[PDB]
Design a protein around this nucleic acid. Structure first.
Ligand SMILES: [Mg+2]
Ligand SMILES: [Mg+2]
Ligand SMILES: [Mg+2]
Ligand SMILES: [Mg+2]
Ligand SMILES: [Mg+2]
Ligand SMILES: [Mg+2]
Ligand SMILES: [Mg+2]
Ligand SMILES: [Mg+2]
Ligand SMILES: [Mg+2]
Ligand SMILES: [Mg+2]
Ligand SMILES: [Mg+2]
Ligand SMILES: [Mg+2]
Ligand SMILES: [Mg+2]
Ligand SMILES: [Mg+2]
Ligand SMILES: [Mg+2]
Ligand SMILES: [Mg+2]
Ligand SMILES: [Mg+2]
Ligand SMILES: [Mg+2]
Ligand SMILES: [Mg+2]
Ligand SMILES: [Mg+2]
Ligand SMILES: [Mg+2]
Ligand SMILES: [Mg+2]
Ligand SMILES: [Mg+2]
Ligand SMILES: [Mg+2]
Ligand SMILES: [Mg+2]
Ligand SMILES: [Mg+2]
Ligand SMILES: [Mg+2]
Ligand SMILES: [Mg+2]
Ligand SMILES: [Mg+2]
Ligand SMILES: [Mg+2]
Ligand SMILES: [Mg+2]
Ligand SMILES: [Mg+2]
Ligand SMILES: [Mg+2]
Ligand SMILES: [Mg+2]
Ligand SMILES: [Mg+2]
Ligand SMILES: [Mg+2]
Ligand SMILES: [Mg+2]
Ligand SMILES: [Mg+2]
Ligand SMILES: [Mg+2]
Ligand SMILES: [Mg+2]
Ligand SMILES: [Mg+2]
Ligand SMILES: [Mg+2]
Ligand SMILES: [Mg+2]
Ligand SMILES: [Mg+2]
Ligand SMILES: [Mg+2]
Ligand SMILES: [Mg+2]
Ligand SMILES: [Mg+2]
Ligand SMILES: [Mg+2]
Ligand SMILES: [Mg+2]
Ligand SMILES: [Mg+2]
Ligand SMILES: [Mg+2]
Ligand SMILES: [Mg+2]
Ligand SMILES: [Mg+2]
Ligand SMILES: [Mg+2]
Ligand SMILES: [Mg+2]
Ligand SMILES: [Mg+2]
Ligand SMILES: [Mg+2]
Ligand SMILES: [Mg+2]
Ligand SMILES: [Mg+2]
Ligand SMILES: [Mg+2]
Ligand SMILES: [Mg+2]
Ligand SMILES: [Mg+2]
Ligand SMILES: [Mg+2]
Ligand SMILES: [Mg+2]
Ligand SMILES: [Mg+2]
Ligand SMILES: [Mg+2]
Ligand SMILES: [Mg+2]
Ligand SMILES: [Mg+2]
Ligand SMILES: [Mg+2]
Ligand SMILES: [Mg+2]
Ligand SMILES: [Mg+2]
Ligand SMILES: [Mg+2]
Ligand SMILES: [Mg+2]
Ligand SMILES: [Mg+2]
Ligand SMILES: [Mg+2]
Ligand SMILES: [Mg+2]
Ligand SMILES: [Mg+2]
Ligand SMILES: [Mg+2]
Lengths: 113, 49, 154, 50, 138, 117, 101
RNA sequence: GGGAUGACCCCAGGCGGUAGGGGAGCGUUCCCGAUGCCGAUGAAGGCCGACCCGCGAGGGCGGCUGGAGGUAAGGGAAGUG
RNA sequence: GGUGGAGCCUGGGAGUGAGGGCGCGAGCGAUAACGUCCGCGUCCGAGCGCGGGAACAACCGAGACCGCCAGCUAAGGCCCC
RNA sequence: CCGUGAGGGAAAGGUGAAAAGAACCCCGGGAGGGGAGUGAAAUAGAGCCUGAAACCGUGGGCUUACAAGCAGUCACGGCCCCGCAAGGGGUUGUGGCGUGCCUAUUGAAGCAUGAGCCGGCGACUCACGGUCGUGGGCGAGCUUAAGCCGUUGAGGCGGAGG
């Protein structure tokens, strides 16, 4: 039995954060915890908040026994991007996209007979 | 100097191949000789230095 | 593009802007611009030769006659129109209302009896028309009508 | 006669040359105006009866 | 009726002397054997080949003035990068290689063509590596 | 009454991309590159059908020419055995004879090595 | 023990008990046609001439067919010319029963 | 030719094609058919299909989605690809 | 003689009115030009569809309705690729 | 909103039958989610009907580091799936073959124009005359215009005129 948590509409650019996500996929919860603390990215914080909310979700609502779980699946999707005007030389005016993530961590229990 | 510009849009293949090096390396950690917790070497453990 | 709300102004200079080339924005090539060659109010009436309208009236009756579907009648007595009363005279006349009927009479009260039946359409005799004959299985007239039907044609 | 079987004769509402529209109809692209110059142009020619 | 196609065959070896054979004359067959175009089951894509071994490679012989006149040429990358080697010089430098070249040229081009040439082992003078069978055509 | 595009263009464009499944890059993912890609595959497949017939015969021949070169002759001469030898029967399709049924083949060599000679 | 037979302008190698897909021909299904044409006996020395005479192979029409449809297409660049035509080539199926001398 | 007056079967011939001419069809929106018929036991639309019919444009059928519409044969008209 | 996608007549609809290469005959040119301008043919155009010519509109071969894992040939080829 | 001003001038509609619009609990600073609950349905949950395509991502099968290419195609083989089976679908190793689409040109893969990709919008009409043809009506004739009567979308009359 599995438990997941999704943070929707995070103001972070997916490419950036998908990076630390790949750093935890498949690892047990004990190291993934250790990995994000000492990982240096703005994305490391955010992924950790989802990671934890999913552990919390697991052990409470799903009766899953916190010491036996790993990160089964994790992935980040691209939520709606924020467009602001960027004034440019010679009256030019570009548009930068301040982008947005949907982070998903999914937890499952290590088989652990 | 005039104004170089990319001549073709990069294929999804050639950009993803570019990014073949971009993955990170998980930080390197030792078990803390005092506390239970994990810590990076040659450094003062965030719990009880 | 003539009647659409927008201005007559040239949208861009037309050279060196590096963009395509444009006039007013009522131009049909623009989203929200004018329509090309779309519909204007118009009159679809024409004039059939009157001799053709005579003939068609004849023909269409005849075809209903040739099927035996025609029935003439005298006088009803399902008059003083209330569709209760009509639905009797009608039943007696062998009209189930399994077949859509067109009823032609100059009698106001008989006419207004039938109107509401899902299977009946109804006319004064001057109202006679081949469209209404053909949509209807059986045709039924009184003699006051049938006469002028004849005095119509000829 | 029912409204179903009414219909016109085999000539009679010939209907109709519009293209325009695809390759394959023939009349594609140039739309039978055939490439060219002034005749192809929108108000085209100058009144040939004169 | 679908044409027969061979499943994996028995990779038969062969032996050739070359001494006094001409060259392109000798080479022609070496190709046909490398190919395996002489086997009734011949298949274009598979390479059911022969493994052709040649000895006494120093000892090939050729007509005309070719030992002096005939030039080999090698481009490197660089300006003035064309190198020109006359036949005889080659023979005293790396003998064979001349046959190796004559065959490689006569083999097809592409991934499979490149494989077959691997299957031609050419040695100078007598002897060789002794593994397989090798019936000798002369 | 107006008839706007609605569902027609979507469906057409789909017909085609379905055909384009498997193709590289945009050529499978984009209605234009799909359509252009297809024309190509269209004329190819056609032409390569004609060329398939050519392609096989040349295989048949090499096999024959090889096999009766064990029995010591030209393919060139072999066929002029059978022209005259009446064994105008064929082949060249079969060639499984040469492979699968050798002495059937051999016999055919013989019927062919004596032909008006 | 085989044969080599001729139908629809091709040669095919037939056996007793062989479902063989062949060029369409005139029979109603289930009927039998020996094809009076036979080119090679598979016991050898009967070979030769157009046809070894008196021989034939007995096979039974299992019914007719239409093969998987071929989409055959023509395109000519810069001339605004394309043609599509669908094609499925009719055939009849056979069981090769008996080799008759 | 056959006498079915064709639509069906045999025979024989033609069938590269741009400008362009002619000819048949398919599909879309709407009207008559319609106070009808299909429909929650599931409309339109969407997503699959290696299945059937069609030379093709297309039509079917099945499955999943969708949740209130749709609209035959046969004709008419266009903001119709 | 010749039944031909021949011919003639009246009418409806066009498109074209930038051609090019090659052969042969001339002119201009320099017994130059992938030059230019006419004549008679041809092909490309529109047959950048097929085979040969390494590759290649117009040179040689040949006029591609669809299918076949059948046969004879054309030009050009038959030492190997 | 843009323009000193005259003036220019948009985008932007849909939960559900009913708010019954998610008490309370858990993670969290909040956002967000997970349970519970409501509902016929909650990937109908308010960034709310349907929810296509380009686009981005996770998982799976086949494949790929001595090969060279308009990316396809034709053949054989290998691995994977579906079917008793002969058979079919996915994939691609090697082998044959192969100069993008449109447009303009005598001639284009062309190192000549246009197009980043996808979706929607986008161009031969209508009136009145004319001239051919065609389906019908009546035929030494044919035919009405304005208008007048009458009408559930009913038709008739009207002969000036042509
Ligand atoms: Mg700046
Ligand atoms: Mg400024
Ligand atoms: Mg940008
Ligand atoms: Mg400077
Ligand atoms: Mg620089
Ligand atoms: Mg205005
Ligand atoms: Mg305005
Ligand atoms: Mg205005
Ligand atoms: Mg205006
Ligand atoms: Mg102005
Ligand atoms: Mg630009
Ligand atoms: Mg607007
Ligand atoms: Mg508007
Ligand atoms: Mg045309
Ligand atoms: Mg036409
Ligand atoms: Mg025209
Ligand atoms: Mg043009
Ligand atoms: Mg011009
Ligand atoms: Mg003009
Ligand atoms: Mg449109
Ligand atoms: Mg051939
Ligand atoms: Mg081309
Ligand atoms: Mg051209
Ligand atoms: Mg024919
Ligand atoms: Mg032809
Ligand atoms: Mg044609
Ligand atoms: Mg509408
Ligand atoms: Mg019902
Ligand atoms: Mg609709
Ligand atoms: Mg559906
Ligand atoms: Mg449902
Ligand atoms: Mg339009
Ligand atoms: Mg003619
Ligand atoms: Mg004419
Ligand atoms: Mg001129
Ligand atoms: Mg000229
Ligand atoms: Mg000469
Ligand atoms: Mg010259
Ligand atoms: Mg010239
Ligand atoms: Mg000429
Ligand atoms: Mg031209
Ligand atoms: Mg020609
Ligand atoms: Mg070319
Ligand atoms: Mg060639
Ligand atoms: Mg060649
Ligand atoms: Mg050519
Ligand atoms: Mg050659
Ligand atoms: Mg202001
Ligand atoms: Mg509502
Ligand atoms: Mg909350
Ligand atoms: Mg419930
Ligand atoms: Mg939920
Ligand atoms: Mg849904
Ligand atoms: Mg819903
Ligand atoms: Mg949205
Ligand atoms: Mg609703
Ligand atoms: Mg939705
Ligand atoms: Mg999507
Ligand atoms: Mg993946
Ligand atoms: Mg190498
Ligand atoms: Mg490799
Ligand atoms: Mg290939
Ligand atoms: Mg263009
Ligand atoms: Mg131009
Ligand atoms: Mg030009
Ligand atoms: Mg030019
Ligand atoms: Mg270009
Ligand atoms: Mg280029
Ligand atoms: Mg230009
Ligand atoms: Mg252009
Ligand atoms: Mg550009
Ligand atoms: Mg742009
Ligand atoms: Mg579009
Ligand atoms: Mg008119
Ligand atoms: Mg007219
Ligand atoms: Mg007329
Ligand atoms: Mg008349
Ligand atoms: Mg009159």
């Amino acid at each position: 039995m599995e438990a997941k948590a999704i943070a929707r509409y995070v103001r972070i650019s997916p490419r950036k954060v998908r990076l630390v996500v790949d750093l935890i996929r498949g690892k047990s919860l004990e190291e993934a915890r250790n990995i994000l603390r000492y990982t240096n990215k703005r994305g490391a914080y955010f992924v950790a908040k989802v990671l934890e909310s999913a552990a919390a979700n697991a052990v409470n609502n799903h009766d899953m026994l916190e010491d036996r779980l790993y990160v089964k699946a994790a992935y980040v999707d691209e939520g709606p991007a924020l467009k602001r005007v960027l004034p440019r030389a010679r009256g030019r005016a570009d548009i930068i996209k301040k982008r947005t993530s949907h982070i998903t961590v999914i937890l499952g229990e290590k088989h652990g007979k | 100097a005039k104004h170089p510009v990319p001549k073709k849009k990069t294929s999804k293949a050639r950009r993803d191949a570019r990014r073949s090096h971009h993955a990170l390396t998980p930080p390197t950690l030792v078990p803390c000789p005092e506390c239970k917790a994990m810590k990076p070497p040659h450094t003062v453990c965030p719990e009880c230095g | 593009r003539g009647e659409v709300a927008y201005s007559g102004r040239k949208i861009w200079p037309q050279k060196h802007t590096g963009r395509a080339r444009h006039g007013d924005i009522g131009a049909p090539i623009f989203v929200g611009g004018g329509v090309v060659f779309g519909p204007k109010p118009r009159d679809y009436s024409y004039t059939l030769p009157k001799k053709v309208r005579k003939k068609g009236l004849a023909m269409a009756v005849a075809d209903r006659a040739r099927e035996g579907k025609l029935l003439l009648v005298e006088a009803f007595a399902g008059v003083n129109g209330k569709t209760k009363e009509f639905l009797a005279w009608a039943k007696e006349a062998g009209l189930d209302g399994s077949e859509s009927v067109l009823l032609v009479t100059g009698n106001e009260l008989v006419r207004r009896a039938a109107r509401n039946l899902p299977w009946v359409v109804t006319l004064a005799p001057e109202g006679l028309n081949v469209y209404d004959i053909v949509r209807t299985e059986r045709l039924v007239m009184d003699l006051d009508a049938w006469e002028v039907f004849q005095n119509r044609i000829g | 006669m029912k409204l179903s079987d009414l219909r016109p004769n085999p000539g009679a509402n010939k209907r109709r040359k519009r293209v325009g529209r695809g390759p394959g109809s023939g009349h594609g692209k140039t739309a039978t105006r055939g490439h060219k110059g002034q005749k192809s142009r929108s108000g085209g020619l100058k009144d040939p009866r004169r | 009726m679908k044409t027969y196609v061979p499943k994996q065959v028995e990779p038969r070896w062969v032996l050739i002397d070359a001494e006094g054979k001409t060259l392109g004359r000798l080479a022609t067959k070496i190709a046909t054997l490398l190919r395996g175009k002489h086997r009734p089951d011949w298949t274009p894509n598979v390479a059911m080949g022969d493994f052709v071994v040649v000895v006494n490679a120093d000892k090939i012989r050729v007509t005309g003035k070719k030992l002096e006149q005939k030039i080999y040429t090698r481009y490197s990358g660089y300006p003035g990068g064309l190198k020109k080697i006359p036949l005889e010089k080659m023979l005293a430098t790396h003998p064979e290689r001349v046959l190796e070249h004559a065959v490689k040229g006569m083999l097809p081009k592409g991934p499979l063509g490149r494989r077959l040439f691997k299957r031609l082992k050419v040695y100078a003078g007598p002897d060789h590596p002794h593994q397989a069978q090798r019936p000798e055509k002369l | 009454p107006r008839a706007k595009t609605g569902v027609v263009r979507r469906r057409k464009h789909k017909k085609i991309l379905k055909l384009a499944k498997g193709y590289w890059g945009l050529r499978s993912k984009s209605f234009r590159k799909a359509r252009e890609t297809l024309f190509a595959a269209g004329n190819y497949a056609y032409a390569h059908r004609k060329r398939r017939k050519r392609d096989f015969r040349r295989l048949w021949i090499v096999r024959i020419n090889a096999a009766c070169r064990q029995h010591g002759l030209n393919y060139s001469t072999f066929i002029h055995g059978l022209k005259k030898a009446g064994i105008e029967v064929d082949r060249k399709n079969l060639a499984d004879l040469a492979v699968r049924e050798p002495q059937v083949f051999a016999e055919l060599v013989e019927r062919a090595k004596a032909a008006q000679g | 023990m085989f044969a080599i037979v001729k139908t629809g302008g091709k040669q095919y190698r037939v056996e007793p008990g062989l479902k063989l897909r062949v060029e369409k021909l005139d029979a109603e299904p289930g009927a039998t046609v020996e094809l009076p044409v036979l080119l090679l006996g598979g016991e050898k020395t009967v070979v030769g001439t157009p046809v070894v005479e008196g021989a034939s192979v007995v096979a039974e029409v299992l019914g007719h067919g239409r093969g998987k449809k071929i989409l055959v297409s023509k395109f000519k660049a810069k001339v605004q010319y394309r043609r599509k035509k669908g094609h499925r080539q009719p055939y009849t199926e056979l069981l090769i029963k008996e080799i008759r001398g």
